[PDB]
């Protein structure tokens, strides 16, 4: 319930910004399953195992018209590829503060997905914003 | 140094094969030779064993040499034979069970204080017998015989003791003939012939006084002793027509279990066919009156014994087999036509492209329309019955109980299935044979279920099982039984070829 | 609720036309998610990232018999490919005015999808019209 | 509600026939979406667009035992290929009259799909007849 | 409701048999849609059409334990391929008599699909039998 | 309702065992449809047909903790492939006794599929066991 | 109900740890079906069968914040591939104790799947942790 996310960017947001509106029916702070190894079985029952390589992925849904959503849109537009626009190559960092301690920090990452313009649903309400991310290193400081 | 055969042993020059690898029917010969005791059956795995046991001059060795020397269309050999005794005439009581090779003349030193005890109707003993000289086993037998003669007992008054060199049997024949029982017991006297002679040690055969018995009754006792045979015959002089008819009727009493092969002349062939008409399981083979015996009656027996029903392709026809030892019987078309009316088998000679060919011309068994006329189908039925019975007995022996319900039926069908698979593999079962209206009606009548004829046409066989209740004759108690019905098709074979050559 | 779209065409509609009937149970002004980057993880855990190239996509559903629908059909028929018909190569522009400011403008674009003739549903009513579009440049002048 | 279709064939039905039974729970007079153009985005954000080529497609569902259905079956059987049957290569035309004017005319076309024999559903009723079509040129004369 | 099917076989059932139990919740006498032609559109809007070749297909569901089902099973087992069994190559014919006339006849055909043994469903009842077929020629004598 | 299955194995269970617990909501004694022939239609309407080759398939679901299930597990473990374990090559046979006669017998077969260990479902109950099989020859001896 | 799992690791947890929180609506201790053999049918009905090679697979779901879940996360993080982290190659073992005896032991195995960070669902609860595994040898000592 008392969950916040602080986003930092090396160039666009050197001091960082905070987001607190996590939206209603979508899943905030979602992470797909992580595959770490693969196996094979040879003839006569011998088993061999090797390690696969993968990285952490995270996606956060937000309210269509909020300060955090606007900052996220600014970041995505800054990094986006377009006809005639400068592309600022910056690395993003994420720290998630959960209730009862449990801080989680991701160091090196980049924006991947987003929605450029607002869309209206059939019922007549604005739709939410996916804003996918991926990161390289994750450290947990929430033993308490 | 150690002999080095303690670790690695290699034998060279023999190369004996595996004794048994499948199920095979074997020949049984009923002989009147006095060597074989009446109450036992003896099986020989090789011709040399017959030669050693009976001797070179005996007709049994002559039969065995021809029987073991046979190669079928596939490379197979009989590899087994058995003999039984027929009591042609009245016999005095005898005691012989001595197979141990004890005749190494180790009888000296037993001369002092011989006290042999004989347990007859009334027990009587023998005084000290002096065998110290031991010049020969015949002389030892004579000395024993004299001390038997010393007794005033009617059995021992004119008793005789003989010896046979090829075997190692000591025989005593009672003086009275027709009735009597003779036996001996092992005494505690150290100088006793109970251990010195073979009697009263391990297996000893005791035969009582017996009157002459008919061959039909004679074969029944042999079957009771053992029934591990197929296609039996009678050796020696040919039997009378009435005796042959009686044996044929006895064989027909059994349901598709053995084959009876008899040898007859051309003159007697027409007469026998009238008497033995019907009576399935009887084979007639024509004998040549201008040459030796040649043992033509053994021709179907060898073919039957060569078959191995565990291997695929076992089933085979009987109408083309060449026997180099045998001689020619008929050579004319009219004689062959007359013989074929009597359902007689023979060896016929013919010439093709300058080459003379002689082969077993026919494979017909005498019997009724309901019975299996051909030999191959008869043999296949024999094997099938044996296999089914063995499987059912094994199922009974290896289970706690077989409930009188659907579970018992399922168990019995499951047990029988592999035997049916083996039957299909052998060649007993054939598929795809067209079914006529009469056969369709008969099948629907035998099995209440319709559309079973469709299955016997397509796959080739049909089987079902039910259970019921009954009461046995010995006691009034009620018991439960099971019934099953099996329908299958008989295969066809090509035996005649006709063609036409047209030039333009 | 007070949403309006103005369409301009370089040749067919030099002065432009407006559409206000956004239809009932379909989704008006829909936009699929935008992919901006892709990543790969090498052996030993190294991560590499590159930028993907994509453009904005928008689709608007309209009432079967309205002036805006007729103008959209005219545009699609003008740009369509057919047996014997002239093809007018024109670039379309779209500006969307939402309630409380927030104007969004798309400059260079073209039609992609449409439905040639009206279709009746099982219930007995006329069916709606998809009218898909794609655009190159988007600028957001709705900071207020 | 007051909708009719007049079908004409060059050889089988030179004078044409009319169908009015459009059936209940199926979709009569259905048309799939039409694709008109395709796009691609190169490196550095350049956008290129080209025209795709497609034709109009229409499908009409009818009641199993009616005069229009029987005529449609006759047409399909005439044009169909088979073991030993003549094949009449004929071009079909369709005009659709909707309530309040709005005539739609299709010129060159051919039958494509159908069901050879009647089928009964689980409930115990005869099943519906799809009768798919495709056409080359479409003209709209329903400005009123 | 009063529907029957008469099946004939050249070898197995020279005089034919009749089936009347069409089973409850499965679809009896079902036929998939038939494709008769294909089209392509070239550059500049030219349209080309060609005829595809197909045959009629029919499937009939029956009660698990009935005379017609048993005859169908007999036919399928007769034509089936197996380890050691004769295969009777026979052509099947089907005539369908519907209420109010409308006879439909199929001449040359063969069994294709079936289920070898009876299966029990979860509820505890025996399951249905598909018994698919295909035919070459179809003639309709049901103008009345 | 009164359905039983007797399983026999050539080596592991020479005398066979019986199974009577067929489990609740799964389908016991299930068999997929059998394909027997394939067809092709050439140009000008000629039809060609050939026979396909397939074998009978059967699957039976059982209660997690019963004697029949334990025997089935023993059979599957005996025939299974593993690191260091002997593999007994045995052919299995199945006879099914249904109410009102109708015995069905399958001669040559082998286990195909299974589940090694028990699994607990979400509700808190043990899960069922599939135990798939395949067979070569089938004979029906209970048409009565 | 009274089910426990004891996990042992070659290097990370030489003495092992126990997990008892098997979580509510997910499936704990799940195992996919195990394929043991494959078959083929040649022309004329001959059947051939060969053995396939596979290994046991198990997955256990746990409550997001518990001692067992934390130990499982520690075990997964040790073997994982990452930018700059040591990889401890250790073999894991699992023994499962069910109510009424029936112990099941797996000897050689390795972690495969997991979720790196906690995720929150739409309703506002923490999400579940899959923690997949695979093993080589399985022995059953639960005849009682």
Can you spell out the DSSP letters for B175-190? Answer: SS-SS----B---S-S
Strand bridging mode G47-51 / G37-41: antiparallel
User: CA B292, CA B294: separation in Å to the nearest integer?
Assistant: 6
B and A touch per CB criterion (3+ pairs under 8 A): no
Strand bridging mode E4-9 / E17-19: antiparallel
Judged by DSSP in three states, A43 sits in helix
Residues of E in contact with F52 (CB under 8 A): 81
Residues 6+ apart with CB under 8 A from B218: B30, B86, B87
In a domain, F37, yes or no: no
Q: Is D53 on the interface with E (CB under 8 A)?
A: yes
Contact at CB, A82 and C42, closer than 8 angstroms:
no
- Annotate E103-120 with DSSP letters as a single string: EEEEEEEEE-EE-SS--B
Q: Is A33 on the interface with F (CB under 8 A)?
A: no
Tally of structural domains, chain C: 1
Nearest CA in chain E to F136: E83
Residues of C in contact with D59 (CB under 8 A): none
CA pseudo-torsion sign D12, D13, D19, D22: positive
Nearest CA in chain F to A46: F83
Strand spans (E) along F1-144:
4-9, 17-19, 34-35, 37-41, 47-51, 56-59, 92-97, 103-111, 113-114, 132-135, 138-140
Experimental resolution (Å): 3.1
In a domain, G39, yes or no: no
Q: Which tokens belong to A46?
A: 């011998």
Residue with tokens 């998610």: C33
Residues of A in contact with C140 (CB under 8 A): 117
In a domain, F39, yes or no: no
Residue with tokens 């005639």: A84
CA pseudo-torsion sign E57, E63, E65, E68: negative
What 8-state DSSP symbol labels residue E45?
G
In a domain, A75, yes or no: yes
User: CA B335, CA B338: separation in Å to the nearest integer?
Assistant: 5
**B454-482 as b/e: b if 16+ CB within 10 A:** bbbbbbbbbbbbebeeeeeeeeeeeeeee
Q: Is F31 on the interface with E (CB under 8 A)?
A: yes
Check: CB of residue B358 under 8 Å from CB of residue B324.
no
Residue with tokens 């608007």: C60
Structure method: cryo-EM
> Within 13 A of E137's CA, how many CA atoms are on the CB side?
11
Residue with tokens 């031991």: B134
Q: Which tokens belong to E8?
A: 């004939």
CATH number of the domain where residue D28 is located: 2.40.30
Judged by DSSP in three states, B135 sits in coil
The closest of B454, B428, B424, B427 to B439, measured between CA atoms, is: B454
Check: CB of residue A33 under 8 Å from CB of residue G114.
yes
Q: What share of chain D is helix, strand, coil (3-state, %, to 5)?
A: 10, 40, 50
CB atoms within 10 A of CB C118: 21
Contact at CB, F119 and G24, closer than 8 angstroms:
no
CATH number of the domain where residue G61 is located: 2.30.110
User: CA G63, CA G20: separation in Å to the nearest integer?
Assistant: 10
The closest of D31, D49, D29 to D40, measured between CA atoms, is: D49
Q: Where are the alpha helices (DSSP H) in D23-124?
A: 67-79
Report the alpha-carbon angle E2-E5-E8, nearest 5.
160
Q: Which tokens belong to B290?
A: 């201008």
Cα dihedral: D96, D97, D103, D108 (round 10): 20
φ/ψ of residue D47, rounded to 5: -115, 130
Q: Which helix (H) or strand (E) holds A140?
A: strand A138-140
User: CA F138, CA A51: separation in Å to the nearest integer?
Assistant: 48
**For residue E87, what are the CA distances in angstroms to B237, E71, F135?**
56, 17, 20
Residues 6+ apart with CB under 8 A from B18: none
Report the alpha-carbon angle A64-A69-A75, nearest 5.
135
Check: CB of residue E20 under 8 Å from CB of residue E96.
no
User: CA D28, CA D116: separation in Å to the nearest integer?
Assistant: 19
Nearest CA in chain F to D83: F45
User: CA A125, CA D119: separation in Å to the nearest integer?
Assistant: 46
Check: CB of residue G47 under 8 Å from CB of residue E83.
yes
User: CA B369, CA B371: separation in Å to the nearest integer?
Assistant: 5
Residue E35 Cα, gap to closest chain D Cα (Å):
5
Q: Is E46 on the interface with C (CB under 8 A)?
A: yes
Residue B459 Cα, gap to closest chain E Cα (Å):
5
User: CA B435, CA B457: separation in Å to the nearest integer?
Assistant: 7
User: CA B442, CA A58: separation in Å to the nearest integer?
Assistant: 79
User: CA B307, CA B329: separation in Å to the nearest integer?
Assistant: 26
Cα dihedral: B146, B151, B157, B161 (round 10): -40
Residue A122 Cα, gap to closest chain C Cα (Å):
5
E53 vs F34, F43, F56: nearest CB: F43
Q: Which tokens belong to A13?
A: 């947001």
G117 vs A22, A31, A39: nearest CB: A31
Contact pairs from chain C to chain E, CB under 8 Å: 8
Check: CB of residue B174 under 8 Å from CB of residue B159.
yes
Check: CB of residue D99 under 8 Å from CB of residue D2.
yes
Query: Which residues share a beta bridge with C129?
Result: C62
Q: Which tokens belong to C4?
A: 């309006």
Query: Which residues share a beta bridge with D135?
Result: D56, D109
User: CA A100, CA D8: separation in Å to the nearest integer?
Assistant: 77
Neighbours of A, requiring at least 3 CB pairs below 8 Å, are: C, D, F, G
- Annotate G20-44 with DSSP letters as a single string: ----SSS-SSB---EE-EEEEE-GG
Q: SS3 string of chain C?
A: CCCEEEEEECCCCCCCEEECCCCCCCCCCECCCEECEEEEECHHHCEEEEECCCCEEEECCECCCCHHHHHHHHHHHHHCCCCCCCCCCCCEEEEEECCCCCEEEECCEEECEECCCCCECCCCCECCECCEEEECCEEECCCC
Q: Is F113 on the interface with G (CB under 8 A)?
A: yes
Neighbours of F, requiring at least 3 CB pairs below 8 Å, are: A, B, D, E, G
Q: Is A123 on the interface with G (CB under 8 A)?
A: no
Q: Which tokens belong to G63?
A: 């409550």
φ/ψ of residue B49, rounded to 5: -65, -45
User: CA B162, CA B173: separation in Å to the nearest integer?
Assistant: 9
Contact at CB, E82 and G46, closer than 8 angstroms:
no
Query: Of F68, F95, F96, F140, which to mutate for an interface test with B (greatest number of B Cβ within 10 Å)?
Result: F95
Check: CB of residue B219 under 8 Å from CB of residue B17.
no
F and A touch per CB criterion (3+ pairs under 8 A): yes
Contact at CB, E138 and D117, closer than 8 angstroms:
yes
User: CA B146, CA B157: separation in Å to the nearest integer?
Assistant: 10
Residues 6+ apart with CB under 8 A from A31: A56, A57, A58, A59, G115, G116, G117, G119
In a domain, G41, yes or no: no
Q: Which tokens belong to B370?
A: 């309901």
User: CA G140, CA G98: separation in Å to the nearest integer?
Assistant: 12
Residues 6+ apart with CB under 8 A from D29: C118, C119, C120, D3, D5, D22, D58, D59, D60, D96
φ/ψ of residue B371, rounded to 5: -85, 165
Check: CB of residue E79 under 8 Å from CB of residue E111.
yes
User: CA E109, CA E57: separation in Å to the nearest integer?
Assistant: 9
User: CA F79, CA F11: separation in Å to the nearest integer?
Assistant: 10
Query: Which residues share a beta bridge with E93?
Result: E8
Q: Which tokens belong to G32?
A: 């996919």
Nearest CA in chain D to E98: D118
Residues 6+ apart with CB under 8 A from G86: none
CA pseudo-torsion sign A67, A69, A70, A76: positive
Report the alpha-carbon angle D84-D86-D89, nearest 5.
140
Question: Where in the sequence is the domain holding D48, given as residue range(s)?
Answer: 4-140
Q: Which helix (H) or strand (E) holds B337?
A: helix B333-341
Check: CB of residue B272 under 8 Å from CB of residue B339.
no
User: CA C64, CA B92: separation in Å to the nearest integer?
Assistant: 125
- Annotate B393-454 with DSSP letters as a single string: HHHHHTSS---SSHHHHHHHHHHHHHHHHHHHHHTS--------HHHHHHHHHHSSSSSHHH
Check: CB of residue B341 under 8 Å from CB of residue B348.
no
In a domain, A40, yes or no: no
Contact at CB, D81 and F46, closer than 8 angstroms:
no
Residue with tokens 């849109």: A73
Strand bridging mode A92-97 / B160-163: unpaired
Neighbours of E, requiring at least 3 CB pairs below 8 Å, are: B, C, D, F, G
Q: Which tokens belong to B88?
A: 């042609």
B402 alpha-carbon distance from chain centroid: 34
């Amino acid at each position: 319930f008392g969950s916040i996310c602080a986003f930092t960017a090396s160039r666009t947001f050197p001091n960082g910004f905070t987001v607190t509106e996590e939206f209603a029916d979508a899943d905030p702070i979602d992470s797909p399953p992580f595959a770490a190894a693969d196996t094979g079985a040879g003839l006569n029952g011998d088993m061999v195992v090797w390690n696969r390589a993968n990285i952490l992925e995270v996606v956060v849904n937000v309210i269509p018209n909020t300060e955090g959503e606007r900052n996220l849109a600014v970041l995505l537009d800054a990094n986006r590829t377009g006809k005639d626009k400068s592309g600022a190559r910056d690395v993003v960092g994420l720290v998630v503060a959960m209730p009862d301690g449990s801080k989680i920090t991701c160091t090196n990452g980049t924006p991947i997905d987003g929605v450029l313009i607002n869309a209206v649903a059939s019922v007549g309400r604005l739709k939410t914003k996916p804003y996918r991310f991926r990161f390289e290193k994750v450290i947990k400081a929430g033993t308490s | 140094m150690i002999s080095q055969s303690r670790y690695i042993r290699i034998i060279s020059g023999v190369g004996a094969a595996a004794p048994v690898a499948g199920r095979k029917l074997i020949l049984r010969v009923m002989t009147t030779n006095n060597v074989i005791p009446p109450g036992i059956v003896i099986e020989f795995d090789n011709a040399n064993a017959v030669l050693s046991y009976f001797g070179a001059q005996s007709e049994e060795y002559q039969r065995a040499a021809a029987y073991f020397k046979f190669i079928s269309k596939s490379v197979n050999s009989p590899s087994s034979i058995s003999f039984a005794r027929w009591v042609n005439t009245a016999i005095a009581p005898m005691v012989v069970g001595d197979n141990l090779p004890k005749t190494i003349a180790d009888f000296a030193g037993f001369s002092a204080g011989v006290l042999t005890i004989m347990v007859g109707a009334a027990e009587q003993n023998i005084t000290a017998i002096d065998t110290s000289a031991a010049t020969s086993m015949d002389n030892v037998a004579s000395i024993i015989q004299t001390e038997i003669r010393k007794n005033a007992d009617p059995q021992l008054a004119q008793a005789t003791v003989t010896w046979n060199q090829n075997t190692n049997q000591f025989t005593l024949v009672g003086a009275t003939i027709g009735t009597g029982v003779l036996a001996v017991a092992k005494s505690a006297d150290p100088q006793d012939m109970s251990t010195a002679l073979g009697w009263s040690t391990s297996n000893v055969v005791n035969v009582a006084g017996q009157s002459a018995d008919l061959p039909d009754a004679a074969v029944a006792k042999s079957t009771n002793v053992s029934n591990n045979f197929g296609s039996f015959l009678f050796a020696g002089a040919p039997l009378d027509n009435d005796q042959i008819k009686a044996v044929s009727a006895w064989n027909a009493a059994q349901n598709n279990q053995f084959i009876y092969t008899v040898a007859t002349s051309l003159a007697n062939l027409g007469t026998l066919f009238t008497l033995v008409n019907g009576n399935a399981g009887t084979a007639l083979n024509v004998l040549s009156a201008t040459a030796a015996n040649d043992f033509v009656e053994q021709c179907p027996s060898e073919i039957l014994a060569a078959t191995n029903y565990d291997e695929p392709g076992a089933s085979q026809n009987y109408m083309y087999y060449q026997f180099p030892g045998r001689n020619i019987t008929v050579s004319d078309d009219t004689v062959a036509n007359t013989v074929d009316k009597s359902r007689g088998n023979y060896i016929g000679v013919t010439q093709a492209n300058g080459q003379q060919l002689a082969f077993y011309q026919r494979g017909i068994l005498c019997g009724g329309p309901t019975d299996a006329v051909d030999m191959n189908v008869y043999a296949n039925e024999i094997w099938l019955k044996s296999a089914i019975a063995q499987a059912l007995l094994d199922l009974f022996l290896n289970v706690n109980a077989v409930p009188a319900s659907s579970t018992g039926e399922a168990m019995t069908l499951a047990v029988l299935q592999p035997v049916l698979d083996k039957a299909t593999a052998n060649g007993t079962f054939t598929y795809g044979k067209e079914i006529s209206a009469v056969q369709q009606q008969y099948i629907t009548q035998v099995t209440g279920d319709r559309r079973a004829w469709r299955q016997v046409q397509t796959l080739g066989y049909w089987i079902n099982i039910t259970f019921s209740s009954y009461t046995n004759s010995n006691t009034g108690l009620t018991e439960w039984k099971a019934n099953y019905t099996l329908i299958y098709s008989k295969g066809d074979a090509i035996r005649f070829v006709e063609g036409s050559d047209v030039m333009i």
